[PDB]
Amino acid sequence: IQQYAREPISLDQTIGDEGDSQLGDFIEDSEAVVAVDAVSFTLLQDQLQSVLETLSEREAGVVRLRFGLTDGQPRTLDEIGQVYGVTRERIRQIESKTMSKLRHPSRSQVLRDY
Amino acid sequence: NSVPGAPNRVSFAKLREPLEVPGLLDVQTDSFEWLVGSDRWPVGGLEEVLAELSPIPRFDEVKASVDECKDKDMTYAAPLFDFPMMTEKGTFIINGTERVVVSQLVRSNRRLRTVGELIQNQIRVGLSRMERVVRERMTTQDVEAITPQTLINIRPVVAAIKEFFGTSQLSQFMDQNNPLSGLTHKRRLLALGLIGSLSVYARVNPFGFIETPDYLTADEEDRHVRQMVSVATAMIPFLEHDDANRALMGANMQRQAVPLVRSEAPLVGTGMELRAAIDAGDVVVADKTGVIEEVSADYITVMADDGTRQSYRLRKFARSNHGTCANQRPIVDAGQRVEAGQVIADGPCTQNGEMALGKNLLVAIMPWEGHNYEDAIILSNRLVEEDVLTSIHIEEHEIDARDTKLGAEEITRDIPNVSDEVLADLDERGIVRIGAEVRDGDILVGKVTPKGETELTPEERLLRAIFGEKAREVRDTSLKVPHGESGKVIGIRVFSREDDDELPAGVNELVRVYVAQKRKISDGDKLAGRHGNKGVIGKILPVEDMPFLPDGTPVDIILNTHGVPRRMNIGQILETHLGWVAKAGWNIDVAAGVPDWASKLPEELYSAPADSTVATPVFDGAQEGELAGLLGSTLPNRDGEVMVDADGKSTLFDGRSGEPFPYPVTVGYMYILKLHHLVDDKIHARSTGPYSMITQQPLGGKAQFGGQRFGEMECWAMQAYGAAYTLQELLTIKSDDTVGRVKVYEAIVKGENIPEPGIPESFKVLLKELQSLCLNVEVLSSDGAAIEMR
DNA sequence: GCTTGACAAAAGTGTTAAATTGTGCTATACT
């Protein structure tokens, strides 16, 4: 109840105390893009794309759809199997072998730093 | 003088004892004794206020101790029916912070209102406002149900008092980086020319009329026919010869010094240092005559002859308001007799009972190859090796765990994404362990807050599955040491809701970290003497390649002569010669001569040993002629030989070439101070950091990373040069371009050319502001004729 | 290389109980 009863303060209020800078311009926008990350993120995409080129064509397609890298939408095993015309169980079996292949040190050491 | 613990400092003053030298802190106390109607303090001020409104009285012992309130962040107060109280230093504790209420001057010759009357007048507003509701309360009802409690909610009374100490121009945070600063913050006078401090021997009268020593009333001046000096001003030796403006400037710089680890006392001072130190309150004074029983760094206890027993806990490495250290030292030993009012332990900036705001250094007044150019100064590397100008600074850090909209904040060692090396300095709870070393960006306290829905990016999760690190459901909110700070962890204060601990609604736990650092005197810091001379430390030369006396005795610092020409500051040169006199000792040649210059002198000052202290009270100190004679008698150094002539000069040997400096140079000992603001605190740099919310312009909050601000005047200069691109770059892609700033960062890393700037977010917001005002602004392109920023 | 069925966890979906929320109302007389 005592949290509910709190009333807000004025951003337009000046808290400069020798300097006349209002409270408003002191709030850090947390959603604003981090400059370094949007670049390292574009470099991670590139690093992943190349890492997938080692996998099989069918193989890369499954991992993409399962996480939705290409269409931004994850897919259930049933959904993935329907596009490839196979059972939903087989789709599960494929992912496992390719996660252990991606766990192979050659493809991973680069990604651990990321 | 006339004090048991007082050391031996010879005085030149040709006149007798000044006066009572009244207790400097009394002004703040006497007003409070009246306002509270203390027995020691005739109708009391507290009793008077009620009499006025009566009709249309006691306080219980203080809740907690001063030490307890500053620790628990509560207010030192005594309930009245909680009424804040005043301590022995004439200060208040309001929410854990030590505060002082300045005395207003409100004329109608002028009259000042002391703190007591100030707090009284604030009471009346609460009584009238509280009584205004009483009338409405006692009128709105049937009657005979009315009781005094139901009729009176004391909210207006308490609110006015709490609202006075805070958000009031008279009540100010106690300025304390040295005992002098805090002493002069008290006794400072204010007007609605506006600001000034009180006279030394000034004694306010019952109402608040300044009385000058018997004391004379302001109006009494018309009837019948050193007092002009303040406390800070009365400590400047040779004050008469320096200009009045330079004096005030020199006083301000005395209350600007910082406490040094060693706190050596001034070699050439005035009589005020002793009385000024003990009155400040930061020194330990024996209450009753007796003898000590046991002495440990923690406490001192004295076994009085009377049979009673008193003890004193010594503040050790306590952080001041501005981060200065408040360490006390014991000066007495076991089996030592002591007297009432005698000094037992040394405060921060005191030695043996007198204010030690700086150190005594060997000075040469030659311009040393432009390194001491125009205000700067050069020091010997000795001052670093020997920790003479080294001072400790303490910073406090705070972080709390409370209930959140989504969940509950939780602080723990477990962090979402970290290596075990950053946690290598954390304990179970996740707070840094005592005695650990912390660099910039290290973790002090490990805290975490709920987070969701996460909706993590696909490229993020694919790595999550590859490496098998489960994406945690909470986000990291952990305390890290700010950018550009480093030191050891002194202590931790943990407040947890689980057990006890009244932490405000919502908060579930609090932990404060105390970090302190030894600060070696560094090039860039500010030094200054008591005469107003101040400059940055331009360079620090190795002790070897330093101008040194024929002894091979290197000089500490080298001061330039250029400030002197018609800028009078003459006194600074006098304490330099008197400094060499006091350090070397002297024996006048009075056997048959009894030179005429010493005729006015007192006896037995004729002879003094090496390293003796000297006191020249301001407006009657050592006179000019006597100083010359003292330089004639200037006993040798270890093997009989003379280092300073009767001109205060000597042939210095350039420690880098080996050849002597062709001319005799003025050398001596001067008392200089390390000033408050240091390079470490003042240096700032930023490449990229936080950005404000409303306006995308950069801002530095936690982990300073603040951005320098490019004003209009700077833009004027940039335009004057004709540099169109540099100007556009500063105002668009370095400040406001939400898309540009990130693009240029990407460009720099790739090494590709810098991109083309966009539209400053400031201007975009400008259009919306005009539109919000019912003004239809149209961009009006040459071809499309109408554009939306998007 | 892949599919089947058994199966359990998980996510929807409908059905109900609890809570929260919004509106009306209070008759000595009182401007």
UniProtKB/Swiss-Prot annotation, chain B:
Enzyme Commission no: 2.7.7.6
Pfam families: RNA_pol_Rpb2_1, RNA_pol_Rpb2_2, RNA_pol_Rpb2_3, RNA_pol_Rpb2_45, RNA_pol_Rpb2_6, RNA_pol_Rpb2_7
Domain of life: Bacteria
Top enzyme class: transferase
Name this protein carries in UniProt: DNA-directed RNA polymerase subunit beta
Organismal lineage: Bacteria, Bacillati, Actinomycetota, Actinomycetes, Mycobacteriales
Gene Ontology terms for molecular function: DNA binding; DNA-directed RNA polymerase activity; ribonucleoside binding
A GO term from the CC aspect: DNA-directed RNA polymerase complex
Keywords: Antibiotic resistance, DNA-directed RNA polymerase, Nucleotidyltransferase, Transcription, Transferase
Catalytic activity: RNA(n) + a ribonucleoside 5'-triphosphate = RNA(n+1) + diphosphate
BP terms from Gene Ontology: DNA-templated transcription; response to antibiotic
Gene: rpoB
Function: DNA-dependent RNA polymerase catalyzes the transcription of DNA into RNA using the four ribonucleoside triphosphates as substrates. This subunit often mutates to generate rifampicin (Rif) resistance. Interaction with RbpA partially restores Rif-inhibited transcription; once the subunit is Rif-resistant however RbpA no longer stimulates transcription.
Effect of residue 192 to P: Rifampicin (Rif) resistant
Outcome following mutation: residue 175 to Y: Rifampicin (Rif) resistant; RbpA no longer rescues transcription in the presence of Rif. Decreased affinity for Rif, no change in affinity for RbpA
Miscellaneous comment: Mutations in the RRDR sequence (residues 423-449) confer rifampicin (Rif) resistance. Rif blocks transcription initiation but not elongation.
Quaternary data: The RNAP catalytic core consists of 2 alpha, 1 beta, 1 beta' and 1 omega subunit. When a sigma factor is associated with the core the holoenzyme is formed, which can initiate transcription. Interacts with RbpA, which partially restores Rif-inhibited transcription.
InterPro entries: DNA-dir_RNA_pol_bsu_ext_1_sf (IPR042107), DNA-dir_RNA_pol_bsu_external_1 (IPR019462), DNA-dir_RNA_pol_su2 (IPR015712), DNA-dir_RNAP_su2_dom (IPR007120), DNA-dir_RNAP_su2_hyb_sf (IPR037033), RNA_pol_bsu_bac (IPR010243), RNA_pol_bsu_CS (IPR007121), RNA_pol_bsu_protrusion (IPR007644)
UniProt cross-references to PANTHER family, sorted A to Z: DNA-DIRECTED RNA POLYMERASE I SUBUNIT 2 (PTHR20856)
Protein source organism: Mycolicibacterium smegmatis (strain ATCC 700084 / mc(2)155)
Disulfide bond residue pairs: none
Family under the similarity heading: Belongs to the RNA polymerase beta chain family.
Record has Hydrolase as a keyword: no
